[PDB]
């Protein structure tokens, strides 16, 4: 286990725009060893990558192609972390 | 089940090549109503699409980036059809 020791936060968990990279961070320092899985589900395909953060958290960026409501899940050892899944409204680009 | 009335078959359930569209067909005619889910899981990102085939089956094409073994899932109403997941060895071109 250890999912309860993981926290995720950032703009990409609150709102996104179609085609614009949406970014958030995952606090992993306390969780120990395990599989950290990020998933995006919704009306269009998503591309997800892991990134560096200065603060030592694990950075995530994703891009979706169409507006709509998407669900972003973050699981650790196949267990939802607190507040996952996140419902993220994705708007047409401004 | 209902997923037990679904069948899938084609080169893309047997073997694939990185960068090369891998194709198979799903016979859906007698599962009735429901959600047909195809998934590709493995060492790189997969692009997946559907085509309505002229023979009346549901066509599927996928492309993956890297060689390795991939699991191709075909589920009907969250249940694996017979022989799913398909383990597909993927060669480099």
């Amino acid at each position: 286990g250890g999912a309860h020791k993981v926290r995720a936060g950032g703009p990409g968990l609150e709102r996104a725009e179609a085609g614009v990279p949406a970014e958030f961070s995952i606090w992993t320092r306390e969780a120990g060893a395990g599989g950290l899985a990020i998933a995006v589900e919704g009306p269009s395909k998503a591309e997800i990558s892991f990134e560096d953060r200065k603060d030592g958290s694990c950075g995530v960026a994703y891009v979706v192609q169409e507006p709509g409501d998407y669900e972003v899940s973050v699981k650790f050892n196949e267990e939802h972390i607190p507040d996952s899944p996140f419902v993220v409204p994705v708007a047409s680009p401004s | 089940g209902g997923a037990h009335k679904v069948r899938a078959g084609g080169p893309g359930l047997e073997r694939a090549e990185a960068g090369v569209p891998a194709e198979f067909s799903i016979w859906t005619r007698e599962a009735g109503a429901g959600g047909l889910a195809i998934a590709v899981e493995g060492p790189s990102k997969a692009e997946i699409s559907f085509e309505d085939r002229k023979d009346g089956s549901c066509g599927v094409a996928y492309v993956v980036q890297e060689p390795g073994d991939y699991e191709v899932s075909v589920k009907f109403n969250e249940e694996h059809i017979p022989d799913s997941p398909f383990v597909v060895p993927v060669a480099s071109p």
């Binding site: 395909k45 | 859906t28 009735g32 959600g35 047909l36 790189s44 692009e47 559907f50």
Partner: peptide
């Protein structure tokens, strides 16, 4: 990393 892509369509007679 392990990657998964999935696509779900609704079948309706």
């Amino acid at each position: 990393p392990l990657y998964k892509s999935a696509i779900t369509t609704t079948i309706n007679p």
